[PDB]
Amino acid sequence: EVQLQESGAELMKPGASVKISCKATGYTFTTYWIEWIKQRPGHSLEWIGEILPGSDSTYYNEKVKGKVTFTADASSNTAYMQLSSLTSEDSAVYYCARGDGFYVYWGQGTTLTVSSASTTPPSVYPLAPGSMVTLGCLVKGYFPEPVTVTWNSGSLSSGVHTFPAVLQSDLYTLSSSVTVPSSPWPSETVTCNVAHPASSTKVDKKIVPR
Amino acid sequence: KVFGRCELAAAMKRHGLDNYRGYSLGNWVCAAKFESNFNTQATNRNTDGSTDYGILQINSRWWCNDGRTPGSRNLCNIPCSALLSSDITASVNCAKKIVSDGNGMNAWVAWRNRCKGTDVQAWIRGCRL
Amino acid sequence: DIELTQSPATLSVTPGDSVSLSCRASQSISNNLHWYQQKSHESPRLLIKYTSQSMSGIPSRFSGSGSGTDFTLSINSVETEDFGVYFCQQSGSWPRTFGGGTKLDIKRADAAPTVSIFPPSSEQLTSGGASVVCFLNNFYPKDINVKWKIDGSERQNGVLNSWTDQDSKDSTYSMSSTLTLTKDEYERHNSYTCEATHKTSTSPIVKSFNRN
């Protein structure tokens, strides 16, 4: 019943600062410490610091102290972590967790992207052929992450492969394929649904014979 | 809050610590001085997963509950956070139980190291009590 | 800080087999060590607490042992759903520190990829660009070589490759390869080939299409 809900993905330019939130419920908010952890690819999980909600008590791990600031609003069971003078090294997924010695309750994590690049909607292109049949969609040149891809609005889920995006020349490119019987397509339309929330872009690309 | 020497002495006297279980006021002010330097906010982290809290650095293993310390007993039956209060009531009430557990003020290592057997009255000399 | 060294960094195991993971601490932390399992894009899930206390609701196949500075996480009768990264974390001191993680992959029978090639779309062409995509799906092991050729000529530049995480179902891997060029360069050539060389055969799987 204990739950920690964090704020969404963030994109900021270097030098700026961001404030991530962690709203916790299901337990006495002023009794447990809320601990913050940073995770980066090719890097081990790093403990950033902790705060005891409502007591004004905090503790930092200098790797991120002069730039980290914890605060909490007991009236809404929310703890906050502020990172200042952001640089690309700050780019990572940040988690809040209740202090139980071990960490049993984790927030879902918030992804921060620190870049000088601008938000860009993806270009969605249908992949049709020139046994079963494989179709797909190319979602290219967008920033920042993430993008979500479904097929026939969720009606096609098995036999789908949505590939991790790859950052090429400061823009992300991703692809997704779906394999269906030769009986379903082209007899029936297949559509890839692409959404990129940072640019509030939603695209329903239909795959039709060439 | 960072208490003043005489301010804390007066507050501790008002809380019944003057000669509590045979311990003169000076011992308590001296204990507070070396445990937390008179800072109600102070906290100390150990190596056994426990944390020390407040003006009198009360430990999360036996006395208060902070929900992350192994072998917790919470003998003072109160969350450690309550021990970071600006007023010293919670810390005093818990200390009274601690000092009564069988070791007297010895339960406070800083007191034992720097106060025990010293002219502790000096901690209240120029104080209007 | 207390340094937790996890060994080894990766593990390949056949379902039904039992394995062990190691975590050694730079200094004694008594039994204040915990183990976690983390899937991609998910929060770590606690498996074992205080060295040997199994978190409630966790499969019985997970066991923990050790004390002081040497700890072990045992995964008995590994199952396909067990792929992912495992970490150890100590709570004895502050800052809390984590082990570097051990990535566990499922060992499955070798399988050749199902290869599909796609010419650029009318929409991309109309925009001035041209990407050719090649999907190499459901194969094992992960290691695979992909070569693009234009009119019999190798093209190593302008290629973007991406691998999926291991399939929780069949334990296979899939890969996408994208060759991007200009409309003009694309319009200047006729044959586009995607050649996949996998250990399942010394002869590459070749898929192609001709503009005409």
Side-chain angles (χ1 to χ4, degrees), chain A residues 35 39 50 103 107 134 164 175, chain C residues 36 38 43 94 96 162 176:
Chain A
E35 296 178 56
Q39 178 163 50
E50 62 183 32
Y103 301 115
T134 298
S175 66
Chain C
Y36 305 76
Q38 180 178 42
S43 300
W94 280 256
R96 274 79 169 74
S162 187
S176 168

Side-chain angles (χ1 to χ4, degrees), chain A residues 127-129 133-137 151 176-179 185 190 207, chain C residues 118 135:
Chain A
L127 301 177
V133 58
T134 298
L135 303 174
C137 273
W151 288 93
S176 178
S177 74
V178 55
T179 298
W185 189 90
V190 161
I207 314 303
Chain C
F118 304 85
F135 289 126

Side-chain angles (χ1 to χ4, degrees), chain C residues 51-71:
Chain C
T51 304
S52 55
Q53 287 181 180
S54 59
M55 227 283 89
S56 73
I58 301 299
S60 62
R61 85 190 68 132
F62 290 103
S63 293
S65 60
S67 288
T69 66
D70 190 351
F71 304 81

